[PDB]
Design a protein around this motif. Structure first.
Motif, PDB file in Angstrom:
ATOM      1  N   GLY A   3     -36.717  19.085 -34.516  1.00 39.69           N
ATOM      2  CA  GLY A   3     -35.703  19.315 -33.486  1.00 39.69           C
ATOM      3  C   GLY A   3     -35.263  18.420 -32.671  1.00 39.69           C
ATOM      4  N   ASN A   4     -35.835  17.469 -32.364  1.00 43.34           N
ATOM      5  CA  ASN A   4     -35.436  16.220 -31.454  1.00 43.34           C
ATOM      6  C   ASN A   4     -34.993  15.029 -32.491  1.00 43.34           C
ATOM      7  OD1 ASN A   4     -38.424  17.552 -30.611  1.00 43.34           O
ATOM      8  ND2 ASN A   4     -36.970  17.578 -28.895  1.00 43.34           N
ATOM      9  N   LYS A   5     -34.790  15.103 -33.586  1.00 46.46           N
ATOM     10  CA  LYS A   5     -34.342  13.946 -34.314  1.00 46.46           C
ATOM     11  C   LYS A   5     -32.981  14.378 -35.110  1.00 46.46           C
ATOM     12  CE  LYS A   5     -35.501  10.801 -35.206  1.00 46.46           C
ATOM     13  NZ  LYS A   5     -36.393  10.528 -36.199  1.00 46.46           N
ATOM     14  N   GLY A   6     -32.386  13.433 -36.036  1.00 50.72           N
ATOM     15  CA  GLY A   6     -31.320  13.769 -36.679  1.00 50.72           C
ATOM     16  C   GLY A   6     -30.168  12.849 -36.587  1.00 50.72           C
ATOM     17  N   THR A   7     -28.952  13.306 -36.703  1.00 52.78           N
ATOM     18  CA  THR A   7     -27.722  12.283 -36.242  1.00 52.78           C
ATOM     19  C   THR A   7     -26.654  13.068 -35.502  1.00 52.78           C
ATOM     20  OG1 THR A   7     -26.429  10.926 -37.077  1.00 52.78           O
ATOM     21  CG2 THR A   7     -26.865  12.706 -38.556  1.00 52.78           C
ATOM     22  N   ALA A   8     -25.912  12.454 -35.139  1.00 51.50           N
ATOM     23  CA  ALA A   8     -24.592  13.150 -34.260  1.00 51.50           C
ATOM     24  C   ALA A   8     -23.470  12.284 -34.513  1.00 51.50           C
ATOM     25  CB  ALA A   8     -24.859  13.516 -32.953  1.00 51.50           C
ATOM     26  N   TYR A   9     -22.183  12.860 -34.516  1.00 49.06           N
ATOM     27  CA  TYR A   9     -21.288  12.261 -34.718  1.00 49.06           C
ATOM     28  C   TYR A   9     -20.067  12.764 -33.759  1.00 49.06           C
ATOM     29  CZ  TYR A   9     -23.243  12.018 -39.410  1.00 49.06           C
ATOM     30  OH  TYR A   9     -24.363  11.737 -40.392  1.00 49.06           O
ATOM     31  N   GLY A  10     -19.231  12.129 -33.232  1.00 48.92           N
ATOM     32  CA  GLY A  10     -18.209  12.339 -32.062  1.00 48.92           C
ATOM     33  C   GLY A  10     -17.235  11.274 -32.148  1.00 48.92           C
ATOM     34  N   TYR A  11     -16.353  11.867 -30.918  1.00 45.68           N
ATOM     35  CA  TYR A  11     -15.472  10.771 -30.583  1.00 45.68           C
ATOM     36  C   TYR A  11     -15.713  10.246 -29.280  1.00 45.68           C
ATOM     37  CZ  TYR A  11     -12.647  13.614 -34.022  1.00 45.68           C
ATOM     38  OH  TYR A  11     -12.081  13.997 -35.238  1.00 45.68           O
ATOM     39  N   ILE A  12     -15.742   9.003 -29.148  1.00 45.27           N
ATOM     40  CA  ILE A  12     -16.356   8.222 -28.068  1.00 45.27           C
ATOM     41  C   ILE A  12     -14.784   7.860 -27.116  1.00 45.27           C
ATOM     42  CG2 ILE A  12     -17.283   6.293 -26.987  1.00 45.27           C
ATOM     43  CD1 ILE A  12     -18.744   5.936 -29.242  1.00 45.27           C
ATOM     44  N   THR A  13     -14.782   8.301 -25.830  1.00 39.68           N
ATOM     45  CA  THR A  13     -13.597   8.117 -24.930  1.00 39.68           C
ATOM     46  C   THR A  13     -13.857   7.328 -23.763  1.00 39.68           C
ATOM     47  OG1 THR A  13     -12.712  10.291 -25.641  1.00 39.68           O
ATOM     48  CG2 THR A  13     -11.937   9.370 -23.772  1.00 39.68           C
ATOM     49  N   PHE A  14     -13.137   6.329 -23.649  1.00 36.62           N
ATOM     50  CA  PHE A  14     -13.631   5.261 -22.695  1.00 36.62           C
ATOM     51  C   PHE A  14     -12.381   5.161 -21.715  1.00 36.62           C
ATOM     52  CE2 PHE A  14     -14.580   0.568 -21.664  1.00 36.62           C
ATOM     53  CZ  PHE A  14     -15.063   1.028 -20.452  1.00 36.62           C
ATOM     54  N   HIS A  15     -12.284   5.757 -20.582  1.00 35.79           N
ATOM     55  CA  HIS A  15     -11.257   5.507 -19.354  1.00 35.79           C
ATOM     56  C   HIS A  15      -9.833   6.014 -19.978  1.00 35.79           C
ATOM     57  CE1 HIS A  15     -13.011   1.988 -16.981  1.00 35.79           C
ATOM     58  NE2 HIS A  15     -13.168   3.329 -16.211  1.00 35.79           N
ATOM     59  N   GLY A  16     -10.296   7.257 -20.953  1.00 39.49           N
ATOM     60  CA  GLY A  16      -8.872   8.224 -21.205  1.00 39.49           C
ATOM     61  C   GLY A  16      -8.506   7.903 -22.613  1.00 39.49           C
ATOM     62  N   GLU A  17      -8.980   6.608 -23.141  1.00 37.09           N
ATOM     63  CA  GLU A  17      -8.631   6.171 -24.361  1.00 37.09           C
ATOM     64  C   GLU A  17     -10.020   6.632 -25.397  1.00 37.09           C
ATOM     65  OE1 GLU A  17      -5.916   5.253 -25.450  1.00 37.09           O
ATOM     66  OE2 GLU A  17      -4.932   4.672 -23.423  1.00 37.09           O
ATOM     67  N   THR A  18      -9.569   7.307 -26.467  1.00 32.56           N
ATOM     68  CA  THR A  18     -10.407   7.972 -27.304  1.00 32.56           C
ATOM     69  C   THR A  18     -10.276   7.273 -28.847  1.00 32.56           C
ATOM     70  OG1 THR A  18     -11.044   9.848 -28.278  1.00 32.56           O
ATOM     71  CG2 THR A  18      -8.766   9.856 -27.785  1.00 32.56           C
ATOM     72  N   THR A  19     -11.379   7.466 -29.404  1.00 31.49           N
ATOM     73  CA  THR A  19     -11.319   6.747 -30.979  1.00 31.49           C
ATOM     74  C   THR A  19     -10.345   7.726 -31.745  1.00 31.49           C
ATOM     75  OG1 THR A  19     -13.407   8.178 -31.560  1.00 31.49           O
ATOM     76  CG2 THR A  19     -13.555   5.715 -30.592  1.00 31.49           C
ATOM     77  N   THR A  20      -9.751   7.170 -32.639  1.00 37.15           N
ATOM     78  CA  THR A  20      -8.893   7.810 -33.648  1.00 37.15           C
ATOM     79  C   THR A  20      -9.930   8.729 -34.644  1.00 37.15           C
ATOM     80  OG1 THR A  20      -8.666   6.129 -35.131  1.00 37.15           O
ATOM     81  CG2 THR A  20      -7.215   6.454 -33.561  1.00 37.15           C
ATOM     82  N   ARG A  21     -10.866   8.128 -35.060  1.00 35.07           N
ATOM     83  CA  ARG A  21     -11.738   8.669 -36.219  1.00 35.07           C
ATOM     84  C   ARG A  21     -13.088   9.150 -35.543  1.00 35.07           C
ATOM     85  NH1 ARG A  21     -15.202   5.136 -38.349  1.00 35.07           N
ATOM     86  NH2 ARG A  21     -14.785   2.968 -38.040  1.00 35.07           N
ATOM     87  N   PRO A  22     -13.701  10.123 -35.857  1.00 38.51           N
ATOM     88  CA  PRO A  22     -15.250  10.374 -35.485  1.00 38.51           C
ATOM     89  C   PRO A  22     -16.130   8.919 -35.788  1.00 38.51           C
ATOM     90  CG  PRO A  22     -14.468  12.313 -36.647  1.00 38.51           C
ATOM     91  CD  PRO A  22     -13.295  11.087 -36.951  1.00 38.51           C
TER      92      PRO A  22
END
Ligand code: MG
Ligand code: MG
Lengths: 227, 40, 180, 255, 250, 213, 457, 226
Positions: A132-151
């Motif tokens: 339960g403490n392992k695996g993987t995660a995907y998301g959108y990284i946002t830096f100073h109001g600018e976010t990645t287009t793809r996860p």
RNA sequence: UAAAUUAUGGUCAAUUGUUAGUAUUCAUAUUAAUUUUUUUAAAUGUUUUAUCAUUUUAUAAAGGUUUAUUUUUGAAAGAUUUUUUGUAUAAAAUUUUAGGAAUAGUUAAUAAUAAUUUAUAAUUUUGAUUAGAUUGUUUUGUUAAUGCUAUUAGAUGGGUGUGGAAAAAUAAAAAAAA
């Protein structure tokens, strides 16, 4: 190369920097490419003596002779839980305690919101393995109001240093798909009331008086006498 | 070489080096001041 | 990049690369000591002559009286002399064209000679290392700032071609009437 | 273990590929020896290059060194044909008749509308340029390929009278293609290589006889000696041999 | 740099060649690879006319030419219909459907995604159905203008690709012309009657007060990994230039 | 880009030109086999080992070097990795796809590549084996690959070769074709030495054309 | 004493053209170009190789001295083989434009008349095949291990396998000048000489040709009338010389150049430029007797008309009188925006035209000069992520940002512009940073790094 | 200070003014040879080492040095030393090769004179043009085989007699009647008949066993008596 | 087959041992060096990092070679950036011994062939191959001098083959990312 810090000046060995370029210096080794890192040894050095209060039963030890009192077993479970939580929190521990595995939530580290640094990740999906403490995660990284287009797959999802504040509105059910956050510059029109920039490309925070005084004391310009 | 302060993060690991490569925020700030003179 | 590193004399980024100017000298009695400014690779073998790009020149670290000059009443001209023989053309070629590196002792010698600014090593303990503030630097920048055109012109003169041809030379060089 | 660890024959590097893609991106795998096989081994002989405009229209006439049927080369190629037919019966259509052998010195395309005035000039030029040269002697040996193996011919090594032959053919090209306009397949300043065609695949026969003559048919006779033949006549002829059972006679000079 | 021919090792033995990139439809990395191309293609269709992108009906191809004409074919239909001789697979993987998040939010909400596999297992038909009109403006001359889904309402997109092939197998590289939209210019254009409504200003208003300063800066309390300039990492570890330092703890 | 179109236009106008007695064979020399350096380096048909400062007349290429890309599952110590191999054939200007297949199967010179029947395809589109390169407009820069009979299901573990790291290899399996070449028994001399890379060579993720961090 | 080939003569004549010195070309023509001749109909156009490669016989190897036997590659030996394709028309054109730049009408007209007669009454010479040395022959490369277009999760990377970020500059679909036919080469020569007229005018009046720098840019020059009359006479001469043959050609470059001269020499409105282009197109269609469907204008012509709109909407910024903006007299933002909008919608409806950063810059400049303050919206919607935008876009958008009612919105828009610069790999320009530091007294936005500030101080 | 005397040497650390600072390697060392083998039992079978043998490639006495001033360099402007060589082709038995004998020159300064040393090379040729006796010119090129790095560039002299003999079918040159000796001992012609073959074999074996007996050494003056 | 001169020019060649009928460079001198009177160690903890790992750190003596030792810019220097241009493994000559004879996974052609192809093969008396000796072509000593007499440290097979390059198993007068 790609990022010649202070140009190509080679006055000293340290003039080129600790690492020459963000791209790997040797074509053979790709892993040596420059990337943000967190202290793995310190973050994984979980408190060992905190488990010394009560004994812990092993999983493979299933024989009846080694079984302990149920109160002692519950004490051991509490000890194991607090032992896991003591060093910190990872998104794999916050996801199960957040609805819909915490999809669509904002995850940030302690150092991600201190100083002019301001970065977070909008969670999009989490895959759990047996642990339960392992695996993987995907998301959108946002830096100073600018976010990645793809996860993108998040980095260091296991180290216990993550924080998250639960909001019901941003939760995304498994039926729907997590929407990427709007960009403060392009998607949503800029508004100082809604969001105000903390650091721009040519910005650098002013020197704090405490650090200035400490540096002057170290350099000896300020008087200092032992007590 | 690279200077490692005594007041840095102690790596609580016996299987490796006794001190980490991180640093105090003051150490980061004072390093920038020293690095500014290198650029001059 | 070795199974057993030569711990006594390590270097950086391997061999052979990054030609560097040093001051080689055999460890003899101090009264017979004299170094040699020379440009060589970062790594040197047992004999220094293997990696020797060019020879800059001798340096005698012994203050000597100016016996060659006549006995003059000038106080400054009667101070001790520390003679150093250096090469200018090869030094400039290796410094600029090949972008070599320099060590602290050759840097100090060249700073004394006027070829280079004073090295980072030599510093006065009286004056401490100062600090900087962004607001004050911006205030000074606004207080005085050069024109973009003139700064571009001076940058061009310093870095790109500086020996320009003016209209007088162009008129002299232009072809004469019979072949027009 | 049999010889050198890396044979010299296998140290081939290809420059037709991008520089940085062979080391990491991919590895090219091919047998590079076939394209570097020398012209001497493969039988290829460099024929005069024809311009695109002259390479379209088919030729009409050709110069040849007329030879009696008794000549040694005729019976040498007769025995060669006998051996070829005995070994393999399928190359008979490719093999030409023994009575249709001539030593070609040049090929040209005379338009039929204005052929009458051109042939007189050609024959008078041949007569005036061969009024002085004595009968030639040529030693024939070896095999070659033209049109990517389409044409198989007997090589003509340099020997006595060959220098006179090449000077005469250069003079003929100058006097025929130079002063008066006639479509020579090659260049007037270039010299045509003499040859006698022993085998040839017609364009109509290209459908079922493959794309080229396999080398194993003439491999054993690639360097065979066909001997010395004396030529004392020249003939400007046309591609018409079937009706009279012999070379068509359009112009002749008794050299 | 890489500018050397291979002479250290024999050509028959690939000794240090990089692995060839292969995309598998049993993995969500297929959706990861394909989704941004889909959204770019939709934007291009909505902005400028595109040939062979609009589909009146499902194309009929014989079996012999099925592997010759179908691969690389991408188009769209107004109805939610599926080709025959294809077994249907529905996207039930949250990780697989996560990659279409930007397409669903910014471009057009996606209704469903299905993978169709022929009986011979030598093809893959990705059919993605979007419910609702395009969020972005659609030009009257665009390809999507002829589609009734814009302006049932749902419309689908079909893409054919051979399985177990490099990412270049799909011919989505050609659909990258960045034709701009005329959304702001149409307001001031002659056809629209807002030209008199709009009021332009040439001179900036006078400033009476300085801009509000940033709040008090608090230096970080946690430990730091070191200077990004020396560590050669981008400012926030995501983007930017190493030389231009910003957005870090100081 | 520009080179191909300008060369085609120049060749077209050279063909269209009618006032040309023809190039001089003696004046135009060929490529030499002997030159400095201990490497036999082949160049294009229009390049020479010697310095040729004049641009020669364009010629129609009678021998196109068709390059076909095959999949190959090389055995790395970490595991089986799928990479690319290039087989180059010298086909005539009007060679049909049938003879192209004959040339590739005769010049593959690799035990694994030509194991079963395959079809040549370009950018994912299959090529009809009846027409020649003239119909397709194939040049020397065309990118042609091949699809085998069982490459459409290689994602299955059963189709994938079984490594001894995760999969069990039986006494009947060690007698098969590839697993006989591979040696699960570590010999003293270790005769089958293969390329090795660490499991963490590409990081926590495999090699990809995009960023996943 | 290296005898120059025709290509070397062409390069030296190009240098003379750009320098403006005609005496150098006088010397070059006297020294070498005297023997140059055009291609006669009866002559051989693709001349064969004539120089036999160097060789030594037995006698010339044994008896001849070492200095005679020595052979280094001498360009004088193969100058004849390099002059094998008879490209003297290019030399004639370059000499004519040199004479025009030097302002000698007699010699310029002589050269132009000779070139015109040669191109009208001589066959087209065959261009040489591409030079293997000047342009490297492409080598095969499997584009299988190249980075993807979306390799960076923050922007659209420009993949080497194929272009994906859109061209940053418009290039007309035209081949090299050596591939032009006779009449096409005549049109190209007229285009080139008109471009040389443009260059000479710009050299004569550098201040009156730059964009939005001084008030003199907005005032008509006192020498433009003669140059425009010369251009009109030249184009009329071209149209009189070419009759039926003019219809079945391409005039994209010539139209772009005449539009450019009617834009910069005699400053005309964008609507006037569009009307001139339409008149030229209809005249070209009408001169040829056929169905005559009107040819659509190309990307180059649209770039020219948009640049004319930008020039007419330009403004002097931060004048010495502390005036925020100084505009051209008789400036009508309403009509300028109407014309710009209809032109943009027409070119968007036309599918054959490919947009580029240059025309996007012109549109942005027009919008910001007209002050509609929708230029930022257009940039973010159509140009921020689609094309490789330079710093000039932010330079133009800065005055729009300063036009904001509140300094807070102005400052935040500036911050977001800087963030875009840091993100999409488009470094801010020096003049933009100059404007930022000039307004720093009220915006409190830093535009210089700590390192460069300290070193400058 | 080499020019200073032994007693004049005040110090040895540097050269005070200038000159040549050279190590005084001791040439007068009195090297000694130690005899480790019997006089008639030196392990080598051809050359015997009974004293200190001088070592060196160019430093030996008398001095011998290469002489680049010869016929080949007088004729050709060689880009590299020994690039081009003129010689006669001797031996044509390997396909697509031609063995050429070219003679270089070595100079003895002590005697102030030069001599010519002959060296054989393998020259590659196509179409098999090089026949025995041709005066050919060869030049260096890429490595072709283990011992092939020269190629013929021009046939200065054609061997007309050899070509005519080949045309007639005979060899280009009759084989020489004298060759290398197989063994040091003379080779005696065997002419014995079939009956006497065994007797001749017995005589030969007796001679061989006598030669083997010679290994024993000198026969003692006193015959062995027990 | 003619003299010289508008006169020392263009910069130092110089040999020293008291024997012993005669023949032949051979005892004892001088210089250089060794030798007695006690001159005269090669240092032990290299460093940084994201922590049971990764990144930087490439020719010391060991093994006896005379037809012999030869190669890279892929790391680094190295710079707006992307991108690009090129190479290179091969040679030639000089090669020792008092009494001197055979040598060999072998030559060439072919090819990403052949433990099993084809051929009248290759090395050598113009001194080969084994064996002995010695770390190869800027070094000294002696002399007026064509000579004679010295010189050094280091490239000794592979076998999961990392790396740009094996030079990779103690040995500094090499400051090695503040
Ligand atoms: Mg002795
Ligand atoms: Mg030995």
């Amino acid at each position: 190369r790609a990022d010649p810090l202070n140009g190509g000046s080679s006055m000293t060995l340290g003039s080129k920097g600790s690492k020459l370029s963000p791209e790997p210096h040797r074509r053979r080794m790709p892993w040596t490419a420059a990337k943000e890192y967190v202290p793995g040894v310190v973050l994984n050095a979980r408190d060992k003596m905190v488990l010394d209060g009560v004994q812990l039963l092993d999983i493979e030890s299933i024989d009846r002779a080694s079984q302990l009192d149920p109160l002692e077993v519950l004490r051991a479970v509490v000890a194991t839980r607090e032992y896991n939580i003591s060093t910190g929190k990872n998104i794999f521990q916050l996801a199960s305690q957040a609805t819909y595995n915490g999809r669509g939530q904002r995850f940030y580290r302690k150092e991600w919101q201190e100083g002019t640094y301001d970065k977070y990740v909008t969670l999009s999906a989490i895959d759990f393995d047996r642990d339960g403490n392992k695996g993987t995660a995907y998301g959108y990284i946002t830096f100073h109001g600018e976010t990645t287009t793809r996860p993108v797959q998040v980095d260091f999802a296991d180290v216990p240093g993550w924080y998250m504040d639960f909001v019901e509105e941003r939760a995304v059910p498994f039926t729907g798909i997590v929407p990427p956050p709007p960009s403060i510059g392009t998607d949503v029109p800029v508004d100082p009331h809604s969001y105000r920039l903390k650091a721009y490309p040519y910005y650098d925070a002013p020197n704090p008086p405490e650090f200035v005084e400490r540096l002057l004391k170290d350099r000896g310009v300020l008087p200092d006498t032992p007590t | 070489r690279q200077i490692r302060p005594y007041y840095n993060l102690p790596s609580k690991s016996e299987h490796g080096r006794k001190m980490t490569g991180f640093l105090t925020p003051y150490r980061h700030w004072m390093w920038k001041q020293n690095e500014l003179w290198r650029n001059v | 990049a070795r199974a057993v590193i030569k711990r006594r004399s390590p270097q950086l980024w391997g061999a052979p690369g990054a030609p560097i100017i040093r001051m080689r000298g055999h460890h003899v009695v101090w009264k017979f000591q004299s170094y040699d400014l020379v440009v060589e690779h970062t790594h040197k073998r047992r004999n220094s002559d293997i990696r020797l790009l060019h020879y800059l020149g001798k340096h005698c670290p012994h203050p000597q009286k100016s016996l060659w000059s006549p006995d003059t009443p000038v106080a400054q001209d009667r101070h001790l002399f520390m003679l150093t023989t250096v090469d200018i053309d090869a030094f400039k070629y290796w410094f600029g064209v090949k972008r070599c590196r320099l060590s602290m002792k050759p840097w100090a010698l060249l700073a004394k000679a006027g070829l280079l600014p004073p090295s980072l090593t030599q510093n006065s303990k009286i004056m401490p290392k100062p600090l900087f503030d962004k607001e004050s630097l911006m205030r000074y920048y606004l207080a005085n700032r050069k024109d973009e055109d003139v700064m571009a012109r001076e940058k061009y003169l310093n870095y790109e071609n500086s020996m320009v041809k003016t209209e007088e030379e162009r008129a002299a060089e232009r072809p004469v009437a019979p072949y027009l | 273990e049999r010889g050198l660890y890396f044979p010299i024959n296998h140290r081939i590097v290809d420059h037709r590929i991008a520089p940085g893609v062979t080391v990491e991106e991919t590895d090219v795998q091919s047998r590079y020896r076939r394209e570097l096989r020398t012209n001497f081994a493969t039988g290829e002989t460099r024929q005069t290059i024809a311009p695109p405009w002259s390479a379209r229209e088919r030729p009409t006439h050709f110069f040849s060194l007329r030879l009696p049927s008794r000549n040694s080369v005729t019976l040498r190629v007769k025995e060669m044909h006998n051996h070829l037919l005995f070994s393999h019966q399928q190359c008979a259509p490719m093999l030409v008749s023994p009575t249709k052998l001539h030593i070609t010195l040049g090929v040209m395309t005379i338009p039929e509308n204005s052929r009458e005035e051109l042939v007189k000039n050609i024959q008078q030029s041949m007569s005036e340029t061969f009024a002085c040269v004595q009968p030639l002697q040529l030693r024939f040996r070896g095999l070659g390929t033209f049109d990517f193996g389409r044409v198989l011919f007997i090589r003509v090594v340099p020997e006595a009278d060959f220098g006179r032959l090449e000077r005469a053919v250069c003079d003929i090209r100058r006097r025929v293609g130079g002063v008066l306009g006639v479509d020579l397949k090659g260049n007037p300043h270039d010299s045509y290589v003499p040859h006698v065609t022993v085998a040839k695949i017609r364009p109509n026969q290209r459908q079922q006889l493959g794309d080229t003559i396999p080398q194993s048919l003439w491999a054993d006779y690639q360097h065979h000696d066909f001997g010395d033949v004396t030529l004392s006549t020249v003939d400007l002829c046309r591609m018409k041999g079937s009706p009279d059972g012999y070379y068509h006679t359009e112009g002749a000079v008794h050299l | 740099r890489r500018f050397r021919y291979n002479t250290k090792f024999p050509a028959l033995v690939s000794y240090n060649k990089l692995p060839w990139e292969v995309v598998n439809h049993e993995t969500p990395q297929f959706h990861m690879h394909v989704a941004p191309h889909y959204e770019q293609l939709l934007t291009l269709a909505a902005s400028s006319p595109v040939p062979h992108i609009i589909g009146s009906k499902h194309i009929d191809v014989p079996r012999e030419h099925r592997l010759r004409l179908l691969p690389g074919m991408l188009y769209l239909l107004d109805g939610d219909t599926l080709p025959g001789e294809f077994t249907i697979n529905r996207v039930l993987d949250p990780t697989a459907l996560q990659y279409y998040g930007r397409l669903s939010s910014q471009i057009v909400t996606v209704e469903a995604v299905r993978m169709l596999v022929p009986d011979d297992l030598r093809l893959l038909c990705n059919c993605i159905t979007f419910k609702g009109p395009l969020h972005l403006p659609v030009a009257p001359y665009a390809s999507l203008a002829s589609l009734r889904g814009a302006s049932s309402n749902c419309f689908t997109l079909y893409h054919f690709v051979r399985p177990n092939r490099p990412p270049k197998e799909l011919q989505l590289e050609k659909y990258y012309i960045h034709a701009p939209c005329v959304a702001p210019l149409s307001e001031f254009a002659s056809n629209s009657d807002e030209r008199g409504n709009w009021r332009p200003r040439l001179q900036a208003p006078k400033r009476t007060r300085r801009a509000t300063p940033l709040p008090a800066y608090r230096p970080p309390q946690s430990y730091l990994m070191g200077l990004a300039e020396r560590l050669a990492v981008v400012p926030g570890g995501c983007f930017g230039r190493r030389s231009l330092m910003w957005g870090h703890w100081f | 880009g520009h080179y191909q179109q300008e060369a085609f236009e120049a060749r077209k106008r050279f063909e269209e030109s009618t006032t040309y007695p023809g190039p001089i064979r003696a004046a135009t020399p060929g490529d030499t086999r002997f030159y400095s350096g201990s490497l036999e380096s082949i160049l294009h048909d229009t390049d020479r080992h010697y310095w040729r400062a004049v641009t020669d007349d364009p010629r129609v290429q009678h021998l196109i070097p068709l390059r076909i890309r095959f999949k190959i599952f090389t055995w790395v110590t970490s595991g089986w990795e799928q990479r690319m191999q290039v087989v180059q054939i010298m086909a005539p200007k009007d060679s049909t796809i049938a003879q192209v297949k004959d040339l590739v199967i005769v010049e593959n010179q690799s035990p694994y590549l030509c194991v079963s029947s395959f079809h040549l395809a370009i950018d994912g589109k299959e090529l009809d084996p009846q027409k020649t390169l003239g119909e397709y407009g194939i040049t020397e820069q065309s990118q042609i690959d091949a699809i085998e009979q069982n490459d459409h299901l290689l994602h299955r573990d059963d189709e994938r070769p079984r490594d001894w790291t995760v999969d069990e290899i039986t006494a009947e399996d060690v007698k098969r074709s590839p697993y006989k070449e591979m040696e699960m028994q570590p010999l003293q001399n270790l005769a089958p030495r293969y390329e090795a890379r660490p499991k963490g060579y590409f990081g926590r993720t495999y090699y990809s054309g995009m960023k996943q961090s | 004493q290296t005898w120059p080939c025709t290509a070397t003569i062409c390069a030296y004549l190009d240098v003379c053209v750009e320098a403006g010195e005609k005496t150098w070309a006088m010397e070059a023509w006297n020294r070498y170009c005297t023997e140059l001749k055009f291609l006669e109909p009866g002559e051989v156009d693709p001349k064969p190789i004539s120089r036999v490669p160097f060789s030594l016989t037995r006698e010339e190897l044994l008896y001849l001295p070492k200095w005679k036997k020595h052979f280094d590659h001498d360009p004088n030996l193969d100058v004849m083989d390099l002059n094998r394709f008879n490209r003297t028309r290019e030399v004639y054109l370059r000499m004519a434009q040199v004479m025009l730049a030097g302002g000698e009408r007699n010699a310029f007209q002589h050269f132009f008349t000779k070139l015109e007669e040669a191109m009208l009454n001589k066959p087209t010479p065959v261009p040489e095949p591409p030079n293997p040395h000047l342009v490297r022959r492409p080598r095969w490369a499997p584009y299988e291990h190249c980075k993807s277009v979306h390799h960076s999760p923050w922007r659209l990377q420009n993949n080497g396998r194929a272009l994906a970020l859109g061209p940053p500059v418009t290039i007309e679909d035209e081949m090299q000048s050596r591939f032009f036919s006779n009449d096409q080469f005549l049109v190209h020569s007229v285009k080139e000489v008109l471009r040389i007229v443009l260059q000479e005018h710009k050299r004569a009046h550098p201040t009156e040709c730059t964009r939005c720098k001084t008030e003199a840019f907005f005032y008509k020059t006192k020498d433009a009338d003669e140059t425009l009359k010369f251009c009109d006479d030249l184009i009329e001469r071209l149209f009189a010389s070419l009759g039926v043959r003019l219809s079945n050609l391409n005039t994209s470059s010539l139209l772009s150049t005449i539009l450019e001269v009617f834009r910069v020499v005699g400053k005309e409105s964008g609507a006037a430029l569009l009307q001139r282009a339409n008149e030229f197109l209809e005249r070209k269609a009408s001169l040829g007797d056929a169905e005559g469907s009107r040819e659509n204008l190309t990307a180059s012509n649209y770039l020219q008309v948009l640049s004319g709109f930008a020039d007419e909407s330009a403004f002097v910024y931060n004048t010495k009188k502390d005036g925020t903006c100084q505009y051209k007299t008789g400036f009508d933002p309403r009509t300028t925006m109407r014309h710009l909008a209809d032109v943009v919608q027409e070119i968007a409806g036309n599918p054959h035209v490919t947009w580029a950063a240059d025309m996007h810059l012109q549109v942005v400049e027009t919008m910001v000069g007209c002050g509609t303050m929708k230029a930022n919206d257009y940039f973010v919607r159509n140009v921020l992520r689609q094309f490789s935008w330079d710093s000039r876009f932010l330079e133009a958008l800065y005055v729009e940002y300063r036009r904001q009612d509140d300094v807070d919105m102005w400052a935040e828009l500036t911050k977001r512009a800087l963030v875009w610069t840091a993100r999409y790999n488009a470094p801010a320009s020096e003049r933009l940073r100059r404007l930022i530091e000039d307004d720093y007294d009220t915006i409190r936005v830093q535009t210089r790094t700590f390192r460069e500030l300290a070193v400058f101080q | 200070p080499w020019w200073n005397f032994q007693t004049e040497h005040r110090q040895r650390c540097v050269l005070m003014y200038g000159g040549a600072r050279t190590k005084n390697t001791h040439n007068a060392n009195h090297r000694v040879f130690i005899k480790k083998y019997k006089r008639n039992a030196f392990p080598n079978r051809t050359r015997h080492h009974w004293a200190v043998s001088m070592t060196g490639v160019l430093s030996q006495r008398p001095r011998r040095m290469p002489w680049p001033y010869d016929l080949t360099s007088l004729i050709f402007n060689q880009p590299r030393q020994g690039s081009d060589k003129i010689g006669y082709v001797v031996g044509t038995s390997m396909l697509k090769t031609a063995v050429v004998a070219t003679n270089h020159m070595v100079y003895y300064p002590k005697f102030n004179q030069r001599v010519s040393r002959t060296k054989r090379f393998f020259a590659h040729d196509e179409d098999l043009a090089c026949v025995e006796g041709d005066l050919v010119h060869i030049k260096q090129c890429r490595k072709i085989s283990k011992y092939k790095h020269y190629y013929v560039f021009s046939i200065l002299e054609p061997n007309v007699e050899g070509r005519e003999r080949l045309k007639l079918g005979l060899k280009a040159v009759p084989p020489p009647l004298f060759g290398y000796p197989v063994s040091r001992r003379i080779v005696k012609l065997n002419l014995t008949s079939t009956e006497g073959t065994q007797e001749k074999l017995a005589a030969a074996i007796q001679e061989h066993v006598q030669d083997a007996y010679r290994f024993s050494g000198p026969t003692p003056d006193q015959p062995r008596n027990r």
